[PDB]
Design a protein around this nucleic acid. Structure first.
Ligand SMILES: Nc1ncnc2c1ncn2[C@H]1C[C@H](O)[C@@H](COP(=O)(O)OP(=O)(O)OP(=O)(O)O)O1
Ligand SMILES: [Ca+2]
Ligand SMILES: [K+]
Length: 425
DNA sequence: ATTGTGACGCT
DNA sequence: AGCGTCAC
């Protein structure tokens, strides 16, 4: 009743750069704009691996993690841009720098949590209060929400329906109540329209966004209307929305845990979780997961938007699949050097830009025929930004994995160097 | 022969 | 600490 908290205390947005690496390449090369096109890493094995796909190309069935030769079968006019190669591996610097452009604009409007290179959560609660007090009672015009969908409306041409739903929502709004969660979300959506307009004006990049009361709903909302649109998911919209939502679509339930929720409880949709007590869910999935599931099938989640615009780790990884697996000492040392040199370059830039120094080096490897994605993960001290020293230390840390009697066996299928544990500098 | 990231939880 | 999960 009156004491049941409804998770309506915050306004949270999730901003997601539409096919980001593709947009970066389309900005640089106008011949790629408004065409079916994709970004690929490497080129020899089956044309290279596709890692990003424009919406025009998605219409032909082109997806990430598909070989370029196969994508060309689906879409023979597909245009491709290749990731830069430096020191023998893919180098994502162009995309990291573009991401910083976007994140810096978002940070003007509100505090952000960098979730990935192309995704950030936005805490809008204080921004909405400020904008509400600046309104002082006037309603919100549809003209302030030109790309917003209201999930679940209209009820009772795609752009025509978008506007019908928005009109239903806005006519229903009680603007006089400065504490109405639905009003707060709507003002959040106005601010996100402005943020998205600023991103596009100042970078050329388009994005989609979700606006709701927490991060999981904001992420779910963001996915409902792409590309270049934003979606408001109100608390009231959750029962219908969840009633036919596959559990795997909710952030963190797309893996083994979600599969076990489905198998153990015999359900398919998020909304079905409401039938179970909190103790029942904790009994199947643990105290933390159980309480989380109990609240989140009701639209409630408390995970904060962390004030963190920079990555916490700086990592350099390369797979050596099939017959490219590393089999000699000279090879392992040469690739550790290559990785360590990219890492030193990025670390020196990070120290200059962000006033911090990493203090721990994580070295990880995969060994041929090992079922796990990482076979070994050991850490050593990171005391100066020197590629030769880091590569020597990584070798020293992994060298007892060699079971030979100048050869390396079993062959190595992945090397990974990661700088972690930053401290202010 | 999805690769190259990056965040967080468990024990 | 090292390993596992999840997503991007
Ligand atoms: N597995 C991956 N390997 C390499 N890069 C990836 C991988 N997954 C995603 N990315 C890269 C390419 C994307 O441009 C960028 C953002 O990822 P993601 O948001 O999932 O898709 P996207 O931005 O390309 O399209 P959209 O969000 O519009 O559906 O990160
Ligand atoms: Ca994206
Ligand atoms: K993303």
């Amino acid at each position: 009743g009156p004491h049941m908290a409804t998770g309506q205390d915050r306004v949270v947005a999730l901003v997601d750069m539409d096919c980001f690496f593709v947009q970066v390449e389309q900005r640089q090369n106008p011949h790629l704009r408004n065409k079916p096109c994709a970004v690929v890493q490497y080129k020899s094995w089956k044309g290279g691996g596709i890692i990003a796909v424009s919406y025009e190309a998605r219409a032909f069935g082109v997806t990430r993690s598909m070989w370029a030769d196969d994508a060309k079968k689906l879409c023979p006019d597909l245009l491709l841009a290749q990731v830069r190669e430096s020191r023998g591996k893919a180098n994502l610097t162009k995309y990291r720098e573009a991401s910083v452009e976007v994140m810096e604009i978002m940070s003007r409007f509100a505090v952000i949590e960098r979730a990935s290179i192309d995704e950030a959560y936005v805490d809008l609660t204080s921004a909405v209060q400020e904008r509400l007090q600046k309104l002082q009672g006037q309603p919100i015009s549809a003209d302030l929400l030109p790309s917003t969908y209201i999930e679940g409306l209209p009820q009772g041409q795609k752009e025509g329906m978008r506007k019908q739903g928005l009109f239903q929502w806005l006519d229903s709004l009680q603007i006089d109540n400065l504490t109405s969660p639905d009003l707060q979300l709507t003002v959040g959506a106005v601010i996100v329209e402005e943020m998205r307009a600023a991103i596009e004006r100042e970078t050329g990049f388009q994005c989609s966004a979700g606006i709701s009361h927490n991060k999981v709903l904001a992420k779910l909302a963001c996915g409902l209307n792409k590309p270049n649109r934003q979606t408001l998911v109100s608390h009231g919209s959750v029962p219908q929305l969840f009633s036919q939502m596959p559990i795997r679509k909710i952030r963190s339930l797309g893996g083994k845990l979600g599969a076990s929720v489905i198998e153990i409880l015999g359900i398919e949709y998020m909304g079905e979780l409401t039938q179970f007590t909190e103790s029942q869910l904790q009994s199947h999935f643990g105290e933390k997961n159980g309480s989380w599931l109990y609240a989140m099938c009701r639209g409630i989640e408390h995970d904060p938007v962390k004030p963190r615009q920079l990555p916490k780790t700086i990592g350099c990884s390369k797979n050596f699949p099939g017959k490219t697996a590393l089999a000699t000492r000279e090879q392992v040392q040469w690739w550790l050097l290559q990785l360590a040199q990219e890492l030193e370059e990025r670390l020196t830039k990070d120290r200059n830009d962000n006033d911090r120094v990493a203090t721990q080096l994580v070295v990880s490897i995969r060994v041929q025929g090992d079922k796990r994605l990482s076979s070994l993960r050991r850490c050593c001290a990171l005391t100066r930004y020197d590629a030769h020293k880091m590569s020597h230390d990584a070798f020293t840390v992994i060298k007892n994995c060699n079971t030979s009697g100048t050869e390396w066996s079993p062959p190595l299928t992945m090397l990974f160097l990661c700088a972690t544990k930053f401290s202010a500098s």
